[PDB]
Amino acid sequence: MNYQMITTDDALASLCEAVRAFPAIALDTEFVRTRTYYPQLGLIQLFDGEHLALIDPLGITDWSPLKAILRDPSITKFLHAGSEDLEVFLNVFGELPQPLIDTQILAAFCGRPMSWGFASMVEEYSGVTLDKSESRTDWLARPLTERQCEYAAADVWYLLPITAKLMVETEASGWLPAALDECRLMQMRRQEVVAPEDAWRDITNAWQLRTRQLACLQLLADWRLRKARERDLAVNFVVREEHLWSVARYMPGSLGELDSLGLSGSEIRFHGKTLLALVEKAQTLPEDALPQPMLNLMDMPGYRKAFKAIKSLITDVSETHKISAELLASRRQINQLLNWHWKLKPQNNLPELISGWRGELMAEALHNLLQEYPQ
Ligand SMILES: [Zn+2]
Ligand SMILES: [Zn+2]
Ligand SMILES: [Zn+2]
Ligand SMILES: [Zn+2]
Ligand SMILES: [Zn+2]
């Protein structure tokens, strides 16, 4: 297994010139989890069957050649368990590769766990036991060690042959259309960008607040997300989630009160004045500018009965179509459908359970079931 380190624009351009003739490439990335808002990318790996490249983002300035490869419809891009990879791709390229297929998703439609690990999959198809000794290392350290490079290279080297095997297995089972739609769905979700004004909607206990308190949370979460993106710090390193909620709930009027609420010395010295000003702003906001209270799905009449009924339906669909119930519907997706049914919150698209491949399988049954619960 021979790999090439690519750290210059010219080398990247040369690589892509050769790769463009191939029908598919295996991709992967390595990044570290720190306190930054955007993950710190340490490496991108690519393999077309002949060229195995380890691309060092620190040495690249012009990504154009690779972005061209990544959007080329004649080159199928493959990865395994790529949720985080999608995040990194959007941050460095501004767009996701297409067409892009995830072997973990293909395997799930073939009967494997939605969380089937790369090493396990490689063991199954190649009989090779991967070395995980370099999995949790510092991908930003330089130069990377030979062992690190080998680990990174193996993630695409062994993936390519498996992509061909799984594409055949998935097609042979009749689930390829569904698997590709599912891959598209994950990609669409990752592309969604949260506007600062909507940051509050993702705080899971925001529903417990009254109108004035919620107006405060909206302003606070908007400010925090913008600050996080400005400083490149995860939102909780700006102001802890619990602390931000407390400011919204208790509507403090002094720095002394922020201390009483538990905010740290750093949060107070850097953001105290701002937080208090946001509270005051919400306090003086005109009622016609206040947000509507949230409707806790769990407190809607019939919720528990409907949830149980849907779970039961999913089980029947699962046994009939010989597909995992977890793949058919997660708790998140069931709640998404019920939030839609009862119009408990704004949703951009139709619920996943009654759209795309899932809808084709059970939308009729789900709509029939929902007739038992008043909108
Ligand atoms: Zn060239
Ligand atoms: Zn080359
Ligand atoms: Zn990955
Ligand atoms: Zn990897
Ligand atoms: Zn500011």
UniProtKB/Swiss-Prot annotation:
| One protein family per Pfam | RNAseD_HRDC_C
Stretches assigned to the HRDC domain: 210-289
Q: Where in the cell is it found?
A: Cytoplasm
Q: Which UniProt keywords apply?
A: Cytoplasm, Exonuclease, Hydrolase, Nuclease, tRNA processing
| Cofactor annotation | a divalent metal cation
Where does this protein chiefly localize? cytoplasm
| Alphabetized GO MF terms | 3'-5'-RNA exonuclease activity; nucleic acid binding; nucleotide binding; ribonuclease D activity
Q: Does the keyword Transmembrane helix apply?
A: no
> Which enzyme type, at the first EC level?
hydrolase
Q: Write out the catalysed reaction.
A: Exonucleolytic cleavage that removes extra residues from the 3'-terminus of tRNA to produce 5'-mononucleotides
InterPro entries listed in its UniProt record: 3'-5'_exonuclease_dom, HRDC-like_sf, HRDC_dom, HRDC_dom_sf, RNase_D, RNase_D-like, RNAseD_HRDC_C, RNaseH-like_sf
Q: Which CDD domains match?
A: RNaseD_exo (cd06142)
**GO CC entries:** cytoplasm
EC number(s): the record gives: 3.1.13.5
The transmembrane residues are none
Superkingdom of the source species: Bacteria
Which segments constitute the 3'-5' exonuclease domain? 3-169
Cite a single GO BP annotation. Answer: tRNA 3'-end processing
Question: What family does this chain come from, according to its entry?
Answer: Belongs to the RNase D family.
Name the HAMAP family for this protein.
RNase_D
- Function recorded in the entry: Exonuclease involved in the 3' processing of various precursor tRNAs. Initiates hydrolysis at the 3'-terminus of an RNA molecule and releases 5'-mononucleotides.
The name of this protein is Ribonuclease D
Species of the source: Escherichia coli (strain K12)
